[PDB]
Design a protein around this ligand. Structure first.
Ligand SMILES: *[C@@H](C(=O)O)[C@H](O)C(=O)N[C@@H](CC(C)C)C(=O)NCCC(C)C
Length: 212
């Protein structure tokens, strides 16, 4: 795999979103990987509905948090609508997929990246954007304005984001805290420290959609 990967340069990443006060990071994270893999397979970059996963993934807890892997399974089992059709409201409502016509996209499954393995994660990112989790509760993460982030942070992962690239010394992360945070909404987190958990627990739990 290459020394640098940046899925934004291959037109596979949509604009940075702001999840607002809702703990919907798991849905935002999942959607980034769906947007990425649909562009990779079909050549079209579309925005898909975080709100639909928020409303419809019964294994997750709406704005109280949830699981990127369960949202990803939902899109593989059923499908997902365009964001325009099912826009983000920042609050869990009832599942409205059936009121909004045919799904816009469907995936074929969900894979887990071997945890605690930097190389396995980089290999996955070289193929497509990946949903990853990290500890974002720390003030250093929250106040991040740029640079390669080394922490401090622990491994109490609490925040799903999407890895959309990497370099020799970082993994490039699309956050869902709006374009004012970090590097226009992105963070570069240091890699290659030998910490099996990854910086801020980044290697704890990583999933990506499969699309044939
Ligand atoms: C993340 C956000 O900032 O919106 C959101 O709070 C969330 O979904 N957090 C989850 C932790 C990640 C590891 C996905 C979470 O806490 N999920 C709850 C499910 C378990 C019982 C922890």
């Amino acid at each position: 795999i290459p020394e640098y990967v940046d899925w934004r340069q291959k037109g596979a990443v949509t604009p940075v979103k702001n999840q607002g006060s809702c703990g919907s990071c798991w849905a935002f994270s999942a959607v980034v990987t769906i947007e990425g893999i649909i562009k990779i397979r079909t050549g079209n970059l579309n925005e898909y509905s975080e709100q639909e996963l928020l409303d419809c993934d019964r294994r997750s807890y709406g704005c109280n948090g949830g699981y990127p892997w369960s949202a990803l399974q939902l899109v593989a089992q059923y499908g997902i609508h365009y964001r325009n059709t099912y826009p983000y409201e920042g609050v869990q409502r009832y599942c409205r997929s059936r009121e909004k016509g045919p799904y816009a996209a469907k995936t074929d499954g969900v894979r887990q990246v071997q945890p605690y393995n930097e190389g396995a994660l980089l290999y996955s990112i070289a193929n497509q954007p990946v949903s990853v989790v990290l500890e974002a509760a720390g003030k250093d993460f929250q106040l991040y304005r740029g640079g390669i982030f080394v922490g401090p942070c622990g491994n109490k992962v609490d925040h799903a984001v999407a890895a959309v690239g990497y370099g020799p010394n970082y993994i490039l992360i699309k956050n869902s805290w709006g374009t004012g945070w970090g590097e226009n909404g992105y963070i570069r987190i240091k890699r290659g420290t030998g910490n099996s958990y990854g910086v801020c627990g980044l290697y704890t739990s990583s999933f990506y959609p499969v699309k044939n």
